Design a binder for these strands. Structure first.
Lengths: 205, 80, 80, 85
RNA sequence: UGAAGAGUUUGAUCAUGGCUCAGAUUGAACGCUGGCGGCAGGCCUAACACAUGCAAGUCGAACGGUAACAGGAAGAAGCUUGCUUCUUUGCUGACGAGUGGCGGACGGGUGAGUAAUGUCUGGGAAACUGCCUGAUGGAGGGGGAUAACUACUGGAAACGGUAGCUAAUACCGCAUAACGUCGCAAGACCAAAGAGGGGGACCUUCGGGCCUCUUGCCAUCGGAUGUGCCCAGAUGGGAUUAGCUAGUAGGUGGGGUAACGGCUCACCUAGGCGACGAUCCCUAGCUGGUCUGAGAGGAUGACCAGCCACACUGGAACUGAGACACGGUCCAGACUCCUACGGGAGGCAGCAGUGGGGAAUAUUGCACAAUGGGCGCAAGCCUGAUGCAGCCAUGCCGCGUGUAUGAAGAAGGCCUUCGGGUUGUAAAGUACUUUCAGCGGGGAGGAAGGGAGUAAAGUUAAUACCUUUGCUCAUUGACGUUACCCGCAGAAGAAGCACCGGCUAACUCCGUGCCAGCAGCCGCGGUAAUACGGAGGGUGCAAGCGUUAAUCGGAAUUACUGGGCGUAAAGCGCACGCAGGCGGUUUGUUAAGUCAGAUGUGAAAUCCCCGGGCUCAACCUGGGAACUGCAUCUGAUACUGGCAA
């Protein structure tokens, strides 16, 4: 499913925000965040092992918007390559169009970044798409269209873009609403909350 | 009986044809004798979608076996 | 060249026919142990004179009688 | 029942009793040689060998001896007389 | 780039060992729920029985012809008069039927039979092979016919019988006779078919002969391809299946097949086979492969490809290169149907449909566009092969059902020392977007070809023809206003399903009270149930979710990899010994086992390695490697085996 529900309520028991309605707000601003989303359908305790072990598996899973199947499949291409299995996986996960656009400042929210690509206002190269996954690669060209240098939603997401460092492996152009995905990601510096060893144990039978 | 013929291996509403020498007592998708070619009717730019050999379209046509109209018209346009 | 196959007569009585048992090393598949898996074939002697243990040369050919396909090509040695 | 040329069946009625007679004329002549073989004769076995020699030959040219039988069946009946000779 | 365990016996504990769960999967079914779209799959059972429709023809360029249609001519009419109308005529388009040739022996479907000289792997030898194709040579001259047709005549039909006539690339002689065949030899013996276009010089009784081309025909020897035949090896299970075999085993000579063969026979001999498992009994189409799995292995054989087998039942033969011809014949049999009651007719395991069975599996749809297949020297015609459409969440994949912002945080719930907490930025409220659906409007592409003209630089006649070549022109689209593209309003039209006692992430409040009920296992409930029921809430998955069945995995719990036997499950009560397995030590030899190399082959598909093409992905695809293997060819001699000492 694409969700469509109460973003920030998740934050509470996520114990992290991970970009839920970022633009003016984050934790404990006009919202009740860092609680438990139950009265006593769920409330804080010591935590189980297996809790953690499931939660973190979903941590990595949710900040791309990938379904059940997909992320496993990426694992079946990684453990088919003779290179690093850990690296490869997070490499394939960032090939999704929706993730790339957010990191070119297009969308102030992860959900919003993916809700751009939906309405016809995106394109890649001279090709028009409306597909939230694509093959994104070195020296591609991320392109805004005509009647998307016209929408007042897009502009209103450049605000936050001035407030996020933006990656160094892509050119980013907001002045003509382009930017190229000129070279491969670095994850020498995004594995900072990601322990690959954990998840790949679990996936294994 | 064996003849030069084309032979779909495309999926639905994809016309990828392969020129085979194949039987008329089995089929164009059945028992092959051999491939001999590839052909695009749509003239795709993929890696080697057109092959048609010189050597077997000059040896099994020696002892006889006829080709197809696109092929006939292709002998000239690869200037073979 | 040709092939001639080492058998040992082990039943000669009938006129112009010698029964040979041919022992080759057959390996077990799963347990990988060689064994003697003896197999009679019915060889036609030109004149019967054999018996028991006579190493011979046989070879594959046309039949001459029913259950034949074998001839005597040479008597390596005798042991009757 | 419906066939395109179910007439094929009737056409073969003709060609199965034409063949028939040609072959059985050929089989009466083989019986005439064999007569003379039991007489010890080279003078009535050979009034029935060279007299079926164009017969046997011209019927291989109607294809009614057939295939590699018809490169064999002018030697098969040659064989006969030679025992007796 | 390659495999993890947990729970469950006991008062406690450690082993042993069963049990269960977490995985992956399906031609799956079921229950609930259901926005789109791309790609794939879709009667597994009663191989039970089927209304109907369709799936098998095409060549006039071999024929004799003219039934219909349309013109040409012809006389004629109306003189409905130079225009309507009528008869005649095969002349021409064109073609009914009938003779003649080739397809109907394919393609398609099914897995009932089938443990298999059937399949698979690997070889082999004594064969065939229309369609195909190379070479050389030929196609001479006669005869007898008979369909249609015609005149009669029998039946309800099916389906006939007389009598007469005629054609051919039909039929049968005869001639000619090798690089032919047979024959040691000497010799002997055997073939046919022409049809088309065109034409200058000549000839004709004016139909044609002549000439030139073209396709087709005949023969002989090859090649290709495809196909018979043999062998070896591998092919399932049961000894509560141990004895088996008379063309049986073999040998002669006969006969037969395309060819090798007891394939078959006459005679002759009396053998052959068997526990390295015969004989018999159970069950099964087989393979590439498929699934799962770290692998080995096990399981499996759906779609797709190859092989084999079957077509109402049984049996049988005909023509042919090819058939025991699914939609050919005949005979017998049971069905089933019709009837003029005399007699006939039929066989969906072909497609689509029908009924019955079953847990379950779709429309009597459109079409020759395209691909392939058939007939034909061509044009052209034919196609339930095929391409499309349709129906079904049967599955794989993609996208959407909105984004932002918004609080004392709205009522409204729910829980609450009653301070509040929770639902909750969730809503209301504010802006911002219209993908995709819906509406309006364009629209690429899948088409190459063939057809009408023109160039030949062939061939001959120099010209034709025919073929060839480019050019020139009008066009070839079934799907379907296709991909796609533009506009049009308006969050609009688009979330569900299971679970929350432990394995296992995810609880409260009530009602019930060992009742009701729950439950994969371990197990729940006896009135203060995190396990039952409702509500509130929470959790995981999401146009699906959950349940079952089923196969492999975990399970190294059948173990070659990879298991035990003092007491946990297991050592015959004890000797002897036949087969079998096993062999101290030294030398010589051999090279079978074995080691090395070489060579074929190991189908396509499939895996992988590298790499592309569709808006992505699904899907499509190229090249390399793999193809673990097997046989063959040659070497090596340490070990294993043989031989010798």
């Amino acid at each position: 499913a694409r969700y469509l529900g109460p973003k920030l309520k998740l934050s509470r028991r996520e114990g992290t925000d991970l970009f839920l309605k970022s633009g003016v707000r984050a934790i404990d601003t006009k919202c009740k965040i860092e609680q438990a989303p139950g009265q006593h359908g769920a409330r804080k305790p010591r935590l189980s092992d297996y809790g953690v072990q499931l939660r973190e598996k979903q941590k990595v899973r949710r900040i791309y918007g990938v379904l059940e199947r997909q992320f496993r499949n990426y694992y079946k291409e990684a453990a088919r390559l003779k290179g690093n299995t850990g690296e490869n996986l997070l490499a394939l996960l960032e090939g999704r169009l929706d993730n790339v656009v957010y990191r070119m400042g297009f969308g102030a929210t992860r959900a919003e970044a993916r809700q751009l690509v939906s309405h016809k206002a995106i394109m890649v190269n001279g090709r028009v798409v409306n597909i939230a996954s694509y093959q994104v690669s070195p020296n591609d060209v991320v392109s805004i269209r005509e009647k998307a240098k016209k929408q007042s939603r897009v502009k209103a997401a450049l605000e936050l873009a001035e407030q996020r460092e933006k990656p160094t492996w892509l050119e980013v152009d907001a002045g003509k609403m382009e930017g190229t995905f000129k070279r491969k990601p670095e994850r020498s510096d995004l594995s900072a909350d990601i322990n690959e060893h954990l998840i790949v144990e679990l996936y294994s039978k | 009986m064996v003849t030069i013929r084309l032979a779909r291996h495309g999926a639905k509403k994809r016309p990828f044809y392969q020129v085979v020498v194949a039987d008329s007592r089995n089929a164009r998708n059945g028992r092959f004798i051999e491939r001999v070619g590839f052909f695009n009717p749509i003239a795709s730019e993929k890696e080697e979608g057109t092959r048609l050999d010189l050597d077997r379209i000059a040896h099994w046509v020696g002892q006889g076996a006829t080709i197809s109209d696109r092929v006939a018209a292709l002998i000239k346009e690869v200037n073979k | 060249k040709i092939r001639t196959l080492q058998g040992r007569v082990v039943s000669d009585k009938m006129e112009k026919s010698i029964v040979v048992a041919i022992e080759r090393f057959v390996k077990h598949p799963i347990y990988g142990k060689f064994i003697k898996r003896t197999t009679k074939l019915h060889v036609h002697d030109e004149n019967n004179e054999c018996g028991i243990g006579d190493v011979v040369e046989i070879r594959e050919c046309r039949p001459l009688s029913k259950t034949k396909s074998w001839t005597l090509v040479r008597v390596v040695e005798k042991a009757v | 029942n419906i066939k395109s040329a179910k007439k094929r069946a009737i056409q073969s009625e003709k060609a199965r009793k034409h063949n028939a007679s040609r072959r059985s004329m050929m089989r009466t002549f083989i019986k005439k040689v064999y007569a003379a073989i039991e007489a010890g004769d080279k003078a009535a076995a050979q009034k029935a060998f060279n007299e079926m020699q164009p017969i046997v030959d011209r019927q291989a040219a109607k294809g009614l001896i057939h295939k590699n039988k018809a490169a064999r069946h002018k030697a098969n009946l040659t064989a006969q007389i030679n025992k007796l000779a």
